[PDB]
Design a protein around this ligand. Structure first.
Ligand SMILES: CCCCCCCCCCCCCCCC(=O)O
Ligand SMILES: CCCCCCCCCC
Ligand SMILES: CCCCCCCC
Lengths: 385, 385
């Protein structure tokens, strides 16, 4: 309660905005209209204000658009069917009751496909409006008054939500994508040092969050293409996809840290005395990789270009010293006695596995650097100077 | 869409069952009332039918219980406020708007907590019913005549939905969990064979499905506890929690196949001439591991116990043969002229990493066999005669 409120004040502003929007969609009902029935059709505005008010502006825009489309398509369909029913007499309330089964079946079948998982609420509003329009106006024949009334109540319930969301302390999805891209670099940098220290002593979230967030970055990128230009992002087509490309480049490197963490938790291990012969080189490689990842995160946070100097020189030299040391003491990994216990040999080879994995991690960084250069060039970052 | 219908005929009966329930509600409203009231309040039965129909019986029962608690908790609070607002005479219209503001704020703050994210469907029902029962009876005082005429249409909708869902082709979540476990056992074996075949040439779906579904198993287990005993699952408390343990053991075994697939896509690779020296042992270990996994999958599907003979003897012999072979040719993996280029040394050292990862995969199977024995004992599996 109070702890979460103090930690993040964005959710108290969100809750107060929802309260304000409801209090307005209620004062308008009380005073702006004295009609008796006006107060029974209040559910078509409250459902709208409870289904379209979202955390970000782009999600609210998308949901509003979808709801409008659904309602209009099903009001047109309902009107057309109600007209066409009269053609054959005596078949009334039977040819209207045989179309609800076919519309509900087509709607559900179309709603269960995997591609259409971002329109789940416009199919429900389509079915609800079709059935309501057909059933309500059957006895009296008045279908257009019901259609128009309900549509106006939905635009009256969606425009106050959009105004309140956009004008009182807006939250943007593009800035959330920018901050998640910044955060992943630090999580991976912490994970690598955690793994190396854990293996050399006498993590999970760091690589999991980067390896388990592609969907979040694709939804945040689907909401960011709806928002108008604002703040630091002034072009009319911001390259929001190069952020996803850089995030994927970083996930490809985080899979090796996941494999090193799995190397720490194995059934077959090596004697500590043997591992303490390579401590210096491994600690150097870990320090250099953490420095590089933190420098790339800092340069992405400030929207700056890369300098003239090469950033991978020191990590490359550290990995070359590691290779030289491994070449100088290779007699502690293989059994030289036999040359033409299984546990002892597996314990010996688990150290060569750990070293090979660290070298592969150091070899996968150039792709991340290239993706960063491409993003810094398409997004017009400023000169480091 | 026709193809999706032929691949899963389970999706063509759900749509026809929803259509049939909607048609039954339509007929009851059309023929069992001579007054428009049941036609004018007919949006509540349609909304209930579209909201409360789920793929499984246990999800329908649990979500219906949680949706029937929010409506009965939001219907008494609105009548207590509408009865306590009389005291504040004259200024009795501001106390009814400050309560919509307070309830809105509180319900959104509670819904934003990170442990309540799974119950976002009960807070919407609570907020909608409170706001409707407070904005609908304001100008007349008929607060108890608006909460009793709208609850029988929701009882009609819930009853029709429950009868049609439970009595026409019921779908059970325990069978879904059983089939998921069998499918994961098959997929891991196919991925294991694919990895070795791809490495020795002159995968994603399996481990990616068996490592990214724990949430699905937890949801299916949460739904299967509400269902009554049926078919082969005849017991008051079926041990549905012993399936998740076996799934977790299989996920721990599949992280090594994911590390071997990552070994295939590495930037540093070993020469083919040195790879072909160890072809026989790797092929044998792959054949044995795939046969063992498929045998355990067939034993799980048929609900049968393990026999007298040991199931791990041949894979345990193959691993020892591979170890002996590696011991006899270890001079091909290291440089023995420096004992006291980097790319060549790393390429030589990658083969030992592939071999060590296969040995670790072979070492992780005892835990899965123990989990299977525990499940076969707690669930009263039958003798494998
Ligand atoms: C999501 C917006 C609110 C939707 C309101 C319609 C759902 C009605 C509340 C659920 C009740 C269904 C459970 C059985 C109810 C009963 O036994 O009376
Ligand atoms: C204590 C009685 C609960 C009243 C809830 C009735 C729900 C009415 C739906 C608008
Ligand atoms: C678009 C045809 C007129 C009816 C639309 C009503 C929307 C509910």
């Amino acid at each position: 309660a109070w702890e979460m409120g103090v930690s993040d004040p964005r959710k108290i502003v969100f809750s107060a905005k929802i309260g304000l929007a409801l209090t307005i969609v209620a004062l308008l009902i009380f005073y702006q209209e004295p009609n008796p029935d006006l107060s029974r059709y209040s559910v078509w505005a409250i459902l709208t204000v409870v289904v379209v008010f979202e955390f970000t502006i782009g999600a609210t825009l998308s949901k509003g658009f979808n709801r409008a489309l659904g309602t209009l398509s099903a009001g047109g369909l309902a009107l057309g069917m109600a007209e066409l029913s009269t053609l054959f007499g005596d078949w009334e309330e039977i040819f209207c009751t045989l179309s609800i089964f076919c519309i509900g079946f087509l709607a559900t079948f179309m709603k269960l496909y995997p591609s259409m998982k971002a329109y789940e609420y416009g199919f429900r509003v389509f079915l609800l409006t079709y059935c309501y329009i057909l059933i309500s106006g059957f006895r009296t024949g008045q279908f257009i008054e019901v259609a128009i009334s309900r549509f106006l109540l939905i635009a009256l319930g969606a425009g106050v939500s959009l105004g309140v969301n956009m004008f009182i302390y807006p939250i943007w999805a593009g800035e959330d994508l920018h901050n998640l891209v910044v955060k992943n670099f630090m999580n991976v940098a912490t994970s690598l040092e955690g793994c190396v220290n854990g293996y050399l002593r006498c993590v999970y979230k760091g690589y999991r969050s980067a390896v388990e967030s592609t969907s979040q970055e694709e939804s945040l990128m689907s909401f960011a293409i709806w928002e108008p230009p604002h703040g630091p992002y002034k072009s009319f087509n911001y390259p929001w996809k190069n952020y996803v490309k850089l995030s994927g480049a970083l996930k490809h490197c985080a899979f090796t840290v996941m494999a090193l963490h799995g190397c720490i938790l194995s059934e077959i291990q090596a004697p500590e005395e043997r591992r303490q012969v390579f401590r210096q080189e491994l600690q150097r490689v870990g320090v250099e990789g953490a420095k590089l990842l933190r420098e790339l995160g800092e340069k992405v946070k400030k929207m700056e270009k890369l300098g003239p100097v090469d950033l991978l020189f020191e990590v490359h030299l550290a990995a070359e010293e590691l290779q030289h040391k491994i070449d100088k003491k290779s007699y502690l990994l293989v059994n030289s006695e036999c040359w033409e216990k299984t546990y002892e040999s597996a314990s010996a080879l688990s150290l060569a596995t750990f070293a090979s994995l660290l070298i592969e991690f150091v070899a996968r960084l150039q792709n991340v650097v290239d993706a960063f250069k491409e993003l810094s060039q398409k997004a017009n970052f400023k000169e480091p100077e």
